């Protein structure tokens, strides 16, 4: 149904998904100058000491590292947020070419890439309930800078050549996401939505100010996968990031002076 192209990139999904058009949609671009510095929110709690990476997965838009999420191993506390978020998956977005990639912008700058690690709220029981609630998800947000390379991401880019093309999968396990996690927690904190549809307005969204640093290699080979299926035409699998929204009646919070 929608993708990343022209006839059915983001200025189309509102047809399908009206809640494009919300007043509470992600993501959006932070103003650094506008974002008050809230001395109120807490040091976030990232706890992935017991994570326990499954699965990775080419779903057509991204590639999704998917983690047992059937009890309280890797969990997000803290920060903006009331009680327990566990860790689903994680993924990203990223460019043709290093000038663009990320969804949230700051001061309007555009990263290479963004990680999201999407977790969920355990009070509602299950992810699929959790995106009917507006406190139903927290995704931690991390930008990407090309520079050097991220130790931490080789073992994946390492598999992305067994996962060329829509619907394919490769075990995965005994991965760390900590790995992947630059050295400062400081973070902006709003409320948003699900970047991709369906779009659901339940979204805590904390991204960190530091980007961790990616090689060239690294990122050129996240632009060698595919959109497309197995021996269809090849649609290399880039520049699948929603713009920035309108920010509408909402504030951004600074974790840090
Ligand atoms: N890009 S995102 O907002 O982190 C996100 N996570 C998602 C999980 C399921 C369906 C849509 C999603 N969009
Ligand atoms: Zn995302």
């Given at each position: 149904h929608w993708g990343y192209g022209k006839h059915n990139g983001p200025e189309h999904w509102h047809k399908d998904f009206?809640?494009?058009?919300?007043e509470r949609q992600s993501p959006v671009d932070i103003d650094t100058h506008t974002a008050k510095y809230d001395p109120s929110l807490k040091p976030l709690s990232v706890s992935y000491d017991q994570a326990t990476s499954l699965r990775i997965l080419n779903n057509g838009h991204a590639f999704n590292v998917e983690?047992?999420?059937?009890?309280?191993?890797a969990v997000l506390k803290g920060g903006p947020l009331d009680g327990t978020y566990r860790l689903i998956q994680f993924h990203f977005h990223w460019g043709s070419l290093d000038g663009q990639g990320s969804e949230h912008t700051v001061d309007k700058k555009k990263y290479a890439a963004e990680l999201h690690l999407v977790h969920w709220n355990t009070?509602?029981?299950?992810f699929g309930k959790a995106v009917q609630q507006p406190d139903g998800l927290a995704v931690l947000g991390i930008f990407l800078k090309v520079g050097s390379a991220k130790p931490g991401l080789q073992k994946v880019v390492d598999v992305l050549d067994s996962i060329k093309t829509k619907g394919k999968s490769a075990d995965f396990t005994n991965?760390?996401?900590?790995?992947?996690?630059?050295?400062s927690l400081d973070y902006w904190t709003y409320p948003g939505s699900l970047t991709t549809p369906p779009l659901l307005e339940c979204v805590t969204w904390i991204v960190l100010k530091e980007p961790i640093s990616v090689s060239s290699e690294q990122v050129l080979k996240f632009r060698?996968?595919?959109?497309?299926?197995?021996?269809?035409p090849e649609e290399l699998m880039v520049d699948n990031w929603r713009p920035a929204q309108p920010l509408k009646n909402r504030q951004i919070k600074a974790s840090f002076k």
């Open positions: 009206p809640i494009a058009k919300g983690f047992d999420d059937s009890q309280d191993k009070k509602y029981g299950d991965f760390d996401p900590r790995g992947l996690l630059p050295e060698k996968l595919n959109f497309n299926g197995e021996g269809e």
